[PDB]
């Protein structure tokens, strides 16, 4: 017709947008009409919800943004196209890593194709409010609580942080991950072992997000990941704890790392990287020149300058291995390293607030606890670990 590339995903912010324009033109470029369903929310639920309606509609789109265990779902209601002959092709078992080929199948075959990889556990600083405020970037969670303490005595927001469930939990599995270390996080959020959800160390982990709280701003209800961005961008808060989906921000605001902003790892999981894979999960569809159009997105997505592109807008690393590292930014190169090292080891461990370690029944019990405690001031962390644990088992 030539065929139409319809993706439903979630990038609709000024950066990750820049991202999705990288595809609509090597789409454009390919000879195939792109017809875009971003849908925006911040961490995916509004897309999902337009997805659940979609999958089942009869006009699937050809690829939706679905990631983690969930594909397991989408591969088990049979929607899902297998990529054999692509994938053998274009040698995706030699170019990804093996702990992320396997979440991209469903029973032996690849039914989806990420684009990247995402660190979910850095914090974002403002070096010039920094150094306005005397503060120190902070390697502890005490460091951490001085910066804050500086920040918010030298007039800043201390703490650029958004009220909505998934930014409340990427916090909160930051301080689990600081406190519990890589093995208890795994125990807690892959394993849900019920002694890990409810012990000392958990209880610990929300004792520290009730005092983080504590100098958040109390209007944060509602407002986007990229407000709170924007607040560390025009100088007016020290830090940001996210993603480096928040770098695309940064990179299309002009900005450049050292002197605009830094990227350190959430203080006390140096050596663990909290891993967030975006991929596209690829429905069988019925029209042949939708199909040949699936088929060019299918290849674009681990073509290599689609892989830097891309990455250089996203934030992300590019999930490629063979990549020309020196392409990218300092920060990602960062990434890469800290990935390799915590790779090696057990410190390499995926989200849970990004969908990656649990299905999204179980995430969604423990995103109601999280965000329950943390917006009363008063509650007690020896409450929230009964009504984690209860709760994760309610949901399965
Ligand atoms: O919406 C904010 C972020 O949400 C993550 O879950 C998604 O994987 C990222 O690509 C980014 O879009």
């Given at each position: 017709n ?7 995903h ?7 947008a820049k991202a ?5 033109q090597?789409i454009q ?10 849908v925006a929310?911040?961490g995916?639920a ?7 309606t ?23 209601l049979?929607?899902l196209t297998?990529l054999?002959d692509?994938a053998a092709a274009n040698k995706?078992?030699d170019l990804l890593?093996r702990?992320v ?6 029973d032996?075959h690849?039914v989806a ?6 660190r979910?556990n850095?914090l974002?600083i403002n070096?010039?409010?920094?150094d ?7 390697t502890?969670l005490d460091e951490?609580?001085?910066?804050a ?5 030298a ?7 958004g ?6 939990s990427?916090v ?8 519990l270390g ?5 125990a ?7 002694k890990?959800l409810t012990?000392?160390?958990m ?5 520290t997000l009730?005092r983080?709280?504590?100098y958040?701003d109390?209007n944060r209800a ?10 560390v961008?025009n100088g007016?808060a ?12 940064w990179?299309?605001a002009?900005?450049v790392?050292?002197k ?12 663990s990287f909290?891993y967030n894979?975006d991929?596209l ?6 029209d042949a020149?939708?199909?040949?159009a ?8 681990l ?8 990455n250089?807008?996203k ?11 020196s ?6 190169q960062?990434?890469?390293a800290?990935f390799?090292?915590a790779a090696?080891?057990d410190?390499?461990?995926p989200?849970?607030?990004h969908?990656?370690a649990?299905?999204?029944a179980?995430?969604?019990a423990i ?5 329950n405690?943390?917006n009363?001031?008063?509650a007690?962390?020896?409450?929230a670990?009964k009504q984690?644990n209860?709760?994760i088992?309610?949901?399965?």
């Amino acid at each position: 017709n030539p065929g139409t590339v319809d993706v439903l995903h979630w990038w609709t912010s000024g950066g990750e947008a820049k991202a999705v324009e990288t595809l609509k033109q090597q789409i454009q470029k390919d000879g195939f009409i792109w017809k875009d369903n971003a849908v925006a929310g911040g961490g995916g639920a509004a897309a999902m919800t337009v997805l659940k309606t979609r999958a089942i509609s009869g006009n699937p789109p050809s690829a939706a943004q679905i990631k983690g265990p969930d594909i397991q779902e989408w591969g088990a209601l049979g929607l899902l196209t297998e990529l054999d002959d692509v994938a053998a092709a274009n040698k995706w078992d030699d170019l990804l890593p093996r702990q992320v080929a396997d979440i991209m199948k469903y029973d032996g075959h690849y039914v989806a194709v990420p684009v990247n990889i995402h660190r979910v556990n850095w914090l974002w600083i403002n070096p010039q409010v920094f150094d306005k405020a005397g503060a120190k970037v902070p390697t502890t969670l005490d460091e951490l609580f001085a910066a804050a303490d500086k920040l918010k005595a030298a007039g800043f927001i201390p703490l650029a942080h958004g009220g909505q469930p998934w930014q409340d939990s990427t916090v909160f599995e930051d301080l689990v991950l600081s406190i519990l270390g890589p093995k208890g996080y795994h125990a807690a959020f892959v394993d849900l072992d019920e002694k890990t959800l409810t012990g000392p160390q958990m209880t610990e982990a929300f004792a520290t997000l009730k005092r983080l709280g504590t100098y958040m701003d109390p209007n944060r209800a509602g407002r986007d990941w990229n407000i709170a961005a924007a607040e560390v961008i025009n100088g007016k808060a020290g830090m940001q704890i996210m993603g480096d989906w928040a770098k695309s921000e940064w990179s299309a605001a002009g900005k450049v790392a050292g002197k605009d902003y830094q990227c350190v790892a959430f203080p006390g999981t140096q050596g663990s990287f909290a891993y967030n894979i975006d991929s596209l999960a690829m429905f069988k569809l019925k029209d042949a020149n939708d199909i040949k159009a699936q088929n060019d997105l299918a290849k674009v997505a681990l073509e290599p300058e689609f892989q830097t592109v891309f990455n250089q807008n996203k934030g992300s690393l590019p999930v490629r291995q063979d990549m020309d590292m020196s392409k990218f930014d300092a920060c990602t190169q960062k990434s890469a390293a800290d990935f390799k090292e915590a790779a090696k080891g057990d410190g390499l461990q995926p989200s849970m607030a990004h969908n990656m370690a649990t299905t999204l029944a179980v995430q969604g019990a423990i995103f109601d606890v999280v965000t329950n405690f943390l917006n009363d001031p008063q509650a007690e962390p020896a409450t929230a670990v009964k009504q984690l644990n209860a709760a994760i088992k309610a949901a399965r």
